[PDB]
A paper describes a structure:
Unfortunately, no cocrystals of autophosphorylated [name] WT protein with tepotinib could be obtained. Therefore, we generated a phosphomimetic [name] [name]/[name] mutant expressed from insect cells as a surrogate protein for structural studies. SPR studies with [name] [name]/[name] showed a similar binding affinity (KD = 2.9 nM) and off-rate (kd = 0.0079 s−1, residence time = 2.1 min) for tepotinib as for the 2P form. Accordingly, [name]/[name] thermal shifts for tepotinib were also identical to the 2P form. Although the A-loop was disordered between K1232 and K1244, electron density for Y1230 was still defined indicating π–stacking interactions with tepotinib identical to the WT structure. Overall, the A-loop and αC-helix conformations are similar in the tepotinib-bound [name] WT and [name]/[name] structures, but distinct to the dual-phosphorylated structure. The [name]/[name] structure was obtained by soaking into apo crystals and solved in a different SG (F222) but again no crystal packing interactions are found for A-loop residues. Indeed, A-loop phosphorylation of both Y1234 and Y1235 resulted in a significantly reduced residence time for tepotinib. This is further supported by the crystal structure of the phosphomimetic [name]/[name] mutant, which showed a partly disordered A-loop indicating enhanced protein flexibility but still with identical π-contacts between Y1230 and tepotinib. Accordingly, the [name]/[name] mutant showed reduced residence time and thermal stability for tepotinib binding in comparison to the unphosphorylated WT. Tepotinib showed tight binding affinities to both the WT KD and solubilized full-length receptor, while the phosphomimetic mutants (KD and full-length) indicated reduced affinities.
Numbering used by the authors: 1052 to 1231, 1245 to 1349
Write the structure that this text describes.
Amino acid sequence: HIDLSALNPELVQAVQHVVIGPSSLIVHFNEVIGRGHFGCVYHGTLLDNDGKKIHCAVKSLNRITDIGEVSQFLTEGIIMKDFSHPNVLSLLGICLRSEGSPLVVLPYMKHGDLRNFIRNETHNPTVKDLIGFGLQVAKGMKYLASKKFVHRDLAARNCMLDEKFTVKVADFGLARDMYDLPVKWMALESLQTQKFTTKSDVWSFGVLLWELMTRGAPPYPDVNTFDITVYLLQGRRLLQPEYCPDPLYEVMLKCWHPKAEMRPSFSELVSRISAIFSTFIGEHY
Ligand SMILES: CN1CCC(COc2cnc(-c3cccc(Cn4nc(-c5cccc(C#N)c5)ccc4=O)c3)nc2)CC1
């Protein structure tokens, strides 16, 4: 139980456009589609204002206990609503129950996370398809970066893939969670200082590209998490994947430049990757 009434009228009124009524949402607690640390993702059914059934994903957030966490939850709801972009996940809304825990209502992503999609043997993406997925991620990050938003957790498992094989940058705001660590996707300066910028997201994006070109191989499998900073300070980097073209491996290496100023912007990455994308032939997705 959490008291909706005695929160903060000015804040609560600012949230109203994000709020969903509990009557207007069905959550299928029997059908789990994802596991995080802060909560699981379920199949839900939303009813929009004209009364049409929309198939959605619903994340619970157990641990959102005190008024601080509940207030911060609403603010993240506000932030997410103001983002609109084809390669960025959108928030449908939030549902504060009378008795139960708060619920994050999200669009259903038919083909799940990008890492599990590429890892699955049933799926057969071409080299062009994989470059295309990376290009889509870059466009989302270009949008977020233009809104002065730092992700801090960009990785292939944290991007989702919809019915039309459109990649959505996900795992931010209310959808932030450890899904089923991030040290191996962190920029060298972030490992030492714990300070995150758009240029640290560029590093992480580089590793995400390596994930795509390996079809979801775990990075640095033989390097222990504690000595990763030392590995990178010796200049050691992820090797070129078997079916990764040279010009795209050059892109990855530029993302892993130790000085952050010298890394490309996401704007630059969209240009460079779309140029590389325009030399390949043949797409399954
Ligand atoms: C075989 N399998 C049957 C079920 C099918 C449908 O599954 C779906 C799973 N998840 C969603 C969903 C949509 C929007 C937002 C979120 C929350 N969120 N989750 C993840 C996430 C989910 C599951 C596993 C992993 C990992 N590792 C990561 C990452 C970022 C993020 O923001 C989830 N939609 C559908 C897929 C095929």
